[PDB]
Amino acid sequence: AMGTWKFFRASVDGRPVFKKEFDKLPDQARAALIVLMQRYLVGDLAAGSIKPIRGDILELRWHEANNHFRVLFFRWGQHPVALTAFYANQQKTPKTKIETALDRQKIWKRAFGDTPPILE
């Protein structure tokens, strides 16, 4: 169901940074976000669920909970790579989160390559 999703870590060996962030969220929100991540791959999201943020960064938003839970990610070839997961109060995704996302994309691309290897 989660297909080609990846989860930000700083190195092939490093701390599972995205998962530690994700895991702190409430059960109901974690379950809802997994469903959105699965649907993202199928192509059947409603318009409230996916927003372009800046550059290559995209946002999954849990619409049924006033977009209070979100995942920033980017497409690394055919693999969406989850960069940060967070609770948010305002509709405007905060600057700090977007900077973290941009920073983690650069970190990822530097450690693992700008695009996936042709064979995994």
Curated annotation (Swiss-Prot):
GO terms for molecular function: RNA endonuclease activity. Keywords: Endonuclease, Hydrolase, Nuclease, Toxin-antitoxin system. Induction: Induced by hypoxia and by DNA damaging agent mitomycin C. Part of the Rv1954A-higB1-higA1-Rv1957 operon, as well as the higB1-higA1-Rv1957 operon, which is probably the mitomycin-induced operon; the former but not latter operon is autorepressed by HigA1. Induced in persister cells in response to D-cycloserine. InterPro entries: HigB-like. It holds the Pfam family Gp49. It comes from the Bacteria. One of its GO terms (biological process) is detoxification. Disruption phenotype: A triple higB1-higA1-Rv1957 disruption mutant has no visible phenotype. Its EC number is 3.1.-.-. Belongs to the mycobacterial HigB family. Toxic component of an atypical, type II toxin-antitoxin chaperone (TAC) system. Upon expression in M.smegmatis inhibits colony formation and cell growth. Ectopic expression in wild-type M.tuberculosis has no effect on cell growth; ectopic expression in a triple higB1-higA1-Rv1957 (delta TAC) disruption mutant causes growth arrest, killing a considerable proportion of the cells. This is Probable endoribonuclease HigB1. It comes from Mycobacterium tuberculosis (strain ATCC 25618 / H37Rv).
